């Protein structure tokens, strides 16, 4: 078997392969996560250099891990499928042994552990992927939003963004998001998420995807017209 230590330390104390995997994440399309009072919303950029696409069959950016947890990502698309698959299997395995669906923290911790294992295993390169994992624990109404990255570190976020131009949208969220008073309703949370993406995207046509997750396995993806209404509303208020 191929044994080579690809991820190794350098004189200055850095693991370049892990850091170069972060560059692949920075290249990827933007993804944002914002959690409200009774919901979490996952927003995702879709680059508009691709026309003649078939949006029915093209892989969606947000993936369901279980009926109550979702996973979006930024970075290498092919790598993300491997993490999603492993996460989906672990989700069913947890139900089978514990007789209870995974918590969002547990599922994040598992995915983060997989990412970490690829940073000190022989013959493999790290995942060029950071994830935003969001949902609601079983029989719980408190919203959960977690982030993972190639190194394997994970943490909880009131709101967070990853991918290309993420530092711009993080700047936006840092002043516009109030800890003392998060988005009280679904509409308020979606609007803040769309607003944050509109700082970076280009046009609000078929470039923005929005997925809303609510308690007790209540997940729905918004259509073009539904998202376009938020875009139309924000621009009219902006001209002031």
């Amino acid at each position: 078997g191929y044994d080579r230590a690809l991820s190794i330390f350098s004189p200055d104390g850095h693991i370049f392969q892990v850091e170069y995997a972060l560059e692949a994440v920075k290249r990827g399309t933007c993804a944002v996560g914002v959690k409200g009072k009774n919901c979490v919303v996952l927003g995702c950029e879709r680059r508009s250099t691709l026309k003649l696409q078939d949006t029915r069959i093209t892989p969606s950016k947000v993936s369901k891990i279980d009926s109550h947890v979702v996973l979006s990502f930024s970075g290498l698309n092919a790598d993300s499928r491997i993490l999603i698959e492993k996460a989906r299997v672990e989700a069913q395995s947890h139900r089978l042994t514990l007789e209870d669906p995974v918590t969002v923290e547990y599922l994040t911790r598992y995915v983060a552990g997989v990412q970490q294992r690829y940073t000190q295993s022989g013959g493999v390169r790290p995942f060029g992927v950071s994830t935003l994992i969001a949902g609601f624990d079983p029989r719980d109404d408190e919203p959960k939003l977690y982030q993972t990255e190639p190194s394997g570190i994970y943490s909880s976020w009131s709101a967070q963004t990853i991918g290309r131009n993420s530092k711009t949208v993080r700047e936006f969220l840092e002043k516009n998001y109030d800890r003392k008073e998060p988005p009280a309703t679904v509409e308020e949370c979606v609007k803040l998420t769309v607003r944050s993406l509109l700082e970076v995207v280009q046009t609000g046509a078929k470039n923005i995807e929005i997925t809303v997750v609510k308690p007790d396995s209540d997940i729905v993806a918004l259509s073009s017209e539904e998202i376009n209404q938020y875009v139309t509303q924000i621009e009219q208020e902006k001209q002031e």
Partner: peptide, 15 residues
Amino acid sequence: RRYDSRTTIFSPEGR
């Protein structure tokens, strides 16, 4: 090790 091309690595740019 000397002759390994290292086919499965990242460039500094993340490619």
